[model samples]
Target: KVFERCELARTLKRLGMDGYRGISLANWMCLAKWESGYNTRATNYNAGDRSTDYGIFQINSRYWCNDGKTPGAVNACHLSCSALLQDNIADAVACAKRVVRDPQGIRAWMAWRNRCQNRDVRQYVQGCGV
Candidate 1:
């Protein structure tokens, strides 16, 4: 599902992100924008390692999801890569919660460090009227 920015903001807030889960809503908004443009079906393949990233959160097939093609994948989320590609996003959000539970927090997402971190992401949620 491609979410309007405001719907995404509202969904993130409703999910209780609000910076309390070690990730601010602004950070999430920015992260999703950069990672997948709020498109749930997004996927990126890494030719170097043949690993794939999936979903709005860009959960990696290397550690979190199993794409069957990634050998020796730990699959910590116990979820298929396809699970993250759907529009519903419930599984993606749940799996992302697991990702944030790690000590690295939002830094687990490279985009967060490379762009969203210490930056003003308020504009991503602007005009959402949330």
Candidate 2:
């Protein structure tokens, strides 16, 4: 599922992402925009680490979800990587929440650090009515 920006915003808001762990809704929006462009089935393989990033939030298999192929990977989210590719984003959202609970917070995603950090991210949710 590829969500419209506002639809995703409202959905995230409903899921209580507005200030989860001190990260604002707009910041989450920015992260998703860069990470997966709101597409639930997006996947990226990291040859260097032999891990894969999955779904709307690009949750990685190396440390979050288990793909059973990543070397010495830890399933911190206790979920299968396949769950992150579903049209329904509930599991993906849950795993993303777990990712941020770590010390890195939203910085767990390099895309967010390089693209959303210090930027005017409000535009990502500007007209969402969130």
Candidate 3:
């Protein structure tokens, strides 16, 4: 499921992403935009560590979800990697929350730092009425 910008913004707001862990909804939108372009089924394989990033938020198998292949993966989110790829983003959102609980917070996602941090991210939720 590839979500439109406003659709995703509204959805995230409904899921309580606004101000979650001190990160704003627009920041979350920005992260999702760059991470997976709002595609729920998006995936990326990290050959360096043989880990895979899955879903809209691109949660990684190395320390988050379990794909049964990542070497020494911690499965910190206690979920199957496939869960993150579903069109229904409930699990993805839950896992994202867990990721931010870490000390790194939103910085858990490198893309957030590179693209969303210090940027005018209001455009992500500008017309969403969220």
Task: Pick the TM-score winner.
Answer: 3
Off by over 4 Å in 3: none
TM-score-best of 1 and 2:
2
Off by over 4 Å in 2: none
lDDT for model 2, please.
Answer: 0.93
> In candidate 3, what are the lDDT values of residues 28-85, reduced to their tens digit?
9999999999999999999898999999999999999999989988898899999999
Error of 2 at 18 (Å): 0.7
Supply the global lDDT for candidate 3. 0.94
Error of 1 at 13 (Å): 1.9
**TM-score to true structure, per model:** 0.93, 0.97, 0.98
CA RMSD for every model? 1.3, 0.7, 0.6
State how far residue 27 of model 2 sits from its true place (Å).
0.4
Model 3 earns a TM-score of: 0.98
lDDT of 1 by residue, 13-71 (tens): 87766775657788888989999999998999988888999999999998999999986
lDDT to native, each model: 0.88, 0.93, 0.94
lDDT of 3 at 129: 94
Question: Per-residue lDDT of 47-116 in model 2, one digit per residue for the tens?
Answer: 9989999999999898999999999999999999999999988889899999999999999999999999
